[PDB]
Ligand binder design. Sequence first.
Ligand code: 3PE
Lengths: 494, 75, 558, 61, 101, 81
Amino acid sequence: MSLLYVLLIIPIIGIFLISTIDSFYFFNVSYYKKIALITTILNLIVSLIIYILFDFSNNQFQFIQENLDLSFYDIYLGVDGVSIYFVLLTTIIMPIALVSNWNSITNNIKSYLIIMLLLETLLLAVFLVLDVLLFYIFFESILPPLFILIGLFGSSNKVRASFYIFLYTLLGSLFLLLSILTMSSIVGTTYFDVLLKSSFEYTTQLFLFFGIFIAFAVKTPVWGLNSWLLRAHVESPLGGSIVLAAIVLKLSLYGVFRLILPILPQASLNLTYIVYAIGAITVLYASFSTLRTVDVKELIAYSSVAHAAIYLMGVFSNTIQGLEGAILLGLAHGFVSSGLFICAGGILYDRTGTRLIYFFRGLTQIMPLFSLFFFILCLGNAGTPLTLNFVGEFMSLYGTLERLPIAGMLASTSIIFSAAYSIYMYNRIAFGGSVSLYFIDCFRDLTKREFFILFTLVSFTVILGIYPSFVLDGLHYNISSVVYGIEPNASYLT
Amino acid sequence: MAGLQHYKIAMDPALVRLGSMISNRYKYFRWTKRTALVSFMYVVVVPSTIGYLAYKTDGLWDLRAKRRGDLISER
Amino acid sequence: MIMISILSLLLSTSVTLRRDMSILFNRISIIALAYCILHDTMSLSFISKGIGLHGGLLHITNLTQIFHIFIFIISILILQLTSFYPRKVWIPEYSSLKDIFFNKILYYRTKIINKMGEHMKIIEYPLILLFVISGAVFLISTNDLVSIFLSIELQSYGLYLLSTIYRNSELSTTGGLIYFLLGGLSSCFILLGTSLLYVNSGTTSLDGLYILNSISDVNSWYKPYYLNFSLLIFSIGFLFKVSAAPFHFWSPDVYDAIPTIVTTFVAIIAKISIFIFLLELVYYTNSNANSYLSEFSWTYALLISSLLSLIIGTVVGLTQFRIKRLLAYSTISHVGFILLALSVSSIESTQAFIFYLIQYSISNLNAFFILITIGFSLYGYVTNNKEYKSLLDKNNSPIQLISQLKGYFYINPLLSLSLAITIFSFVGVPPLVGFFAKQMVLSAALDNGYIFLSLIAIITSVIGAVYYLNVIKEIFFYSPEHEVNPVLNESDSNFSLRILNEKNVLIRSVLLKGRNIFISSPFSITISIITNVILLFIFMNKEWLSMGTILVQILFSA
Amino acid sequence: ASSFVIYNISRPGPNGEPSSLHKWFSKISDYKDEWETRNTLMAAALEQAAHDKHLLLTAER
Amino acid sequence: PTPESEAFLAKKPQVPPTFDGVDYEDNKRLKQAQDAIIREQWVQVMMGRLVREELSKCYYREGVNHLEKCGKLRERYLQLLANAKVKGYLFEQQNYWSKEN
Amino acid sequence: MVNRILFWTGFGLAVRFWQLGIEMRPFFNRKSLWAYPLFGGVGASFGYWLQSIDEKQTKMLEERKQAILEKRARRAQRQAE
Ligand SMILES: CCCCCCCCCCCCCCCCCC(=O)OC[C@H](COP(=O)(O)OCCN)OC(=O)CCCCCCCCCCCCCCCCC
């Protein structure tokens, strides 16, 4: 059995144990949550073992299993450098997301844990499948559990949010599916090691680009196709929000490295100016509206839109540093947005029952531990150096600038505006007077649980902000394979 | 009110009512000369301007290893 | 075999007036269909595009025999609803294999199992069902214009009789009247089309019509406009019977008016037979060379109906609040997909067509079985809802409103999950069998240049997903309005169960409550198998998809 | 203190010779040609499978 | 010259960095070529990195006098900077070119 | 991993489990435990039978591929004139 199948199998086992342990012991729900948490820890331990064995400069897919039993739809699993870090992000985020909801899920706890465990398997399968149609199957599989997760555990507007995310993702994905089916018909399969050797003709590439781009712009999301996120990321339970912003936004980014860069190089280069205008517009518009957003969780949700615009522009840069910076930013966004959602949707929300900014002020006076982590997280959101967020923003922005200078210059303005909404939101909540007079009771500071999920997330962003080689070293060789172009005295050697 | 018991908050009805208006404002949008002009400016004009500028300057310049006796222009 | 079962069943039925025999007669109809499967299974050891039989009036193909068996298997599954009581008493002290085979349990069952329910007291119900099956098998196997007409009337007339067999229901008699009246109009179009074929060609043989068409497809005195024009009129009558738009209006009323158990058979069996029969007729009239004939091809009626069924089926379903009317509009939408695959005549589209029809029939079957089982599960529940209290024919159709499913996930979560899996398969969410079905039809349509229809299919699917999501929202997102009956479990209301051995000697007695009444095993097992087939298709797809691949390769074998 | 200790004991020593633990990690994750062998076998098999479907899907009516 | 390390040899390309006369149905041979083009680009790039390192030492060694004593490294680094770049294999895999054209 | 026998033995086990769950009956009471070897045994039988269908289907598809190539070849040789 492959280690990659073990990765997909462990959460299914935990689902089985959670659903059957009532027959061997009214079992306390603590037991259920213990099983699910240990299930995620083991999945993380396996991914760490894979990474220790993983080789940084191999262009062969690693840890694959021979099938020799070909069918119409066979799940082939494999890993390289451009997918190994997304697998690690998924297995680190999932335990933290479980602990972040340890107390706030009060009814239907078995259903909540089974959905999150199933989400872990499906999201991991997205990064590991070696077939383009397998990518769509896992990308779309997470929708029904996400629909149910929002509708069973969401806030007051959960129905409208659940419908929005389902119908937006489905609609975009249906245009991606038509693009994938055209590829499958021309080439005869969507297996990576066969399709990547195909050379689609330019007009085919253009109409293939449209349809894959429509889906990825719905999922990025670009501004104007992002109301599903402003609803779903806010109405979701806290664990749903962490998974939705840390891993689910990353699907469209990893999807660009498999579905556009190797097989649509000519359409990608010829259309980069359309991608860059949309990415530039998204960076400014999302930034200005974040500045005027009064729901604290909606403000953290809108800043995800602005950050994802920069990794999208870095992924179309066709430069090494822009592509590596895009992956670096994707990962750094996962730690920072997880921490800011915990701070808002899990610490403020649990204490007050409200998400309106008008009711918060001067929290530093009574919650020094919260304000310390909240501030460090707000510096990460502003891309402050010593966070992995600066390294990703700088490399992404440099590649975007070098590819198309006017687009990079506008995208660079994010260095001013991400600071503006991060510092503005930090000042209004932690600072900005004495403790808010709307609080009748005093508030306790972070519990040990809250401290150690914030500390862990803050630890990852700072350690990788100082030594980003821990990810870049395993990125360099594989990411070389998606660059398109030639030097005159370097090419066609004899 | 939302699962776990939270602390007592002096929930100010005016502020709560303002928060409700913001959540429901989409239900009351209408096409007027003002709203159409603003929407057209933000969605069409400004993006198409950046798109046109990005189009016209794509490939215009390269800085890498440019010395004196050379040009930044490539095209 | 099907003709012997009908005549033998009729003779036994003729000399009985005992209504307690209905459950036994239904069980025998299951045994009879199992033999029909055995005989047709033995008839699959040859390769041919077709062998004419019985003076050339009928024919057999590998495709014909496969769908004979499939019709029998769907009919055995539907026949369970009238062969077993809906609820059982189960206890953990009568669960061993020695208890089931050598011991017996005694208790007052009449009220619990609904022994004298309406669907348990119609003696001729399994017999009329067999008549419809004979109509359907004969139509698949028809080689001849007169055989077509006789077969379609035989299947149609039994369906009208099935829609009215609950003669004491005003709703049922109304739906039977509507079906017969508009179905009589559609039969006239079929007879008109068959008649115009005969008066122009001088032949009743389908072989002869295909030969005339084949010669006439060359690239002046008797230019053959009649064939496409006749089949156009012919096809419209068949579009009515599969309830394709714009000839769809009848089915949301009829399917809602007739009792739900009847709807299960009525809504599923007829589409299989007409679509399979249409497949061969589509293949053998396809003008290969682009001539004037292709300009007036009758198959554009299929493509227009496909377009209209995609739009009507999804848009009209948005504001449906009655659960059975929603399923009718959901079928019309899925018929639009089936019609698209049939209209594009390619190896890929025929594969897609064959797989789509079989997966859709098992899925629509799972939805009806879950709907019936939920209705029979409310036995020990009460509601004070005012809307539910004003429903008509509650016994015939226990669930009539989508709102009746509100909070059902809190009543029975795994049965609610099975419904949600089935509905998500209708949407086409991977990796459910419904996604792979939609994926195959889209592939073929795109590969043959049907892009505009491919795009309308994806856009309609998002609209259709809205009312599917609305059913799921009702089940999961709200608390239920049904409460367990206080008196069914009131801590002092125990009914007695005796456990006896093979010698009718009492072994033990036990006191029982409403909590010891369960869904009968035939329905739970059938839902469970089909739900797991929908869910786990990605690990089981090889042989099932290969069967359609081989069948199409035979049909196209140059 | 632990970081200082673990860094010191994990050094390759005065000469560029792997330690006892260094040789174990290199041995376990060797895969001298395993990935290439398996990857090549799978690529050719799905290549041929695409060939067969292309033959069946484009067969003359 | 510095001896080629045991680790280095384990990853040394056995094929020339080219796509000429490479059967794309041979999975092993195509991936070998791709690896050779990628590795060759990195070597040229890592060469510039070493020249830059030497230029750095002489600048801090010659101080005021760097404008006169560091020209040889200066020229070398600019030549590498003008020519070396990781461009990938995929344009050259999809586009054959001839000198005689 | 798609071993037919193990998969369909597992399928039968999942049918019994889902059925017990749908019936809201306990998943494991001792006197009912014979059902899992039964449902799994019936599942194993369905999959030995699917095994032999696959063998026939493969042979049929292999013969079809040769016929298409043979058809393609002769038509190509016919066009040589
Ligand atoms: C706002 C914060 C900003 C932070 C910026 C990040 C720091 C960069 C700027 C400061 C740079 C100084 C870093 C220290 C340089 C030397 C590291 C060192 O400790 O080396 C000693 C040890 C062995 O040396 P070795 O490499 O083996 O030499 C022989 C080689 N043949 O090598 C080792 O492996 C030992 C490693 C142990 C950890 C190094 C010591 C860290 C000291 C800083 C700690 C600050 C936090 C204090 C926490 C609370 C303490 C009360």
